[PDB]
Structures are given as structure tokens and as C-alpha cells.
Amino acid sequence: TLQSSHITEWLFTIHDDVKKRALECFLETAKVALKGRNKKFQ
Amino acid sequence: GALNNAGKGMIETNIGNYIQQQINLLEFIKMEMADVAGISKQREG
């Protein structure tokens, strides 16, 4: 099954890259939201 | 007397054997490409 997992690991690799970039995006979004007078972050 | 006997005719064509020949050829060519690429069936899964 490992050699069959190799066939779709390209999908999984690009998916992992997209997830990483999306999480950097969310991190910057949260950083901007911090300086907006929200008491949740406290 | 052939009008009261001889059974019933059949418009039958041996297309199934042709289809099996095509399927066997496809399997052979796919195996040949796998061998040439060095990527065997046991090596893909």
C-alpha cells in the first residue's frame, strides 16, 4: 500500500503546502485583529 | 419438409472473442510499458 500511497502523496504534499500558507494567512489576520480593541485576546 | 423442421436460425456474431482479444492486447501493452519504465505492478502498490 505504501507504493500506492506514493501515487497520491503529491496531492497530499500540495495540500500540506496550502494548509501551511493558509495558517500563516490566519496568523497575520489574527495579528491585525489584536489591535482592534477586542477583549477576547486578553 | 424444411418448413416444419430444422429449428430456428440465429443472427449471431463472435464479437465477444474480438473484445477479449482487445482486452488481452491492452493488458500486454500496459505490462510492456511498465517493464520499459522499470515500474512494475508490484512496485506501484
Side-chain angles (χ1 to χ4, degrees):
Chain A
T1 60
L2 183 63
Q3 294 281 336
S4 59
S5 300
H6 295 158
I7 299 163
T8 68
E9 215 281 332
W10 75 274
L11 282 153
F12 283 101
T13 302
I14 309 178
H15 187 37
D16 287 24
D17 181 73
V18 175
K19 295 155 52 148
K20 179 177 79 71
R21 289 152 42 202
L23 291 180
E24 325 191 346
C25 181
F26 183 87
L27 177 58
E28 311 315 345
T29 303
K31 272 173 49 157
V32 164
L34 267 169
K35 44 173 151 293
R37 314 301 210 90
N38 186 9
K39 314 292 141 203
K40 162 169 200 168
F41 301 107
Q42 283 159 17
Chain B
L3 296 145
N4 288 19
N5 271 343
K8 314 212 181 43
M10 200 82 54
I11 294 153
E12 170 55 18
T13 315
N14 305 134
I15 297 164
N17 312 135
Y18 190 52
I19 288 162
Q20 270 296 302
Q21 273 154 280
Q22 305 324 282
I23 291 173
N24 300 342
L25 279 160
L26 294 173
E27 293 178 353
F28 171 68
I29 296 300
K30 197 181 250 200
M31 280 170 29
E32 217 186 1
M33 183 199 319
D35 301 1
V36 170
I39 307 174
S40 178
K41 288 172 71 66
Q42 194 269 327
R43 193 257 194 279
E44 293 179 353

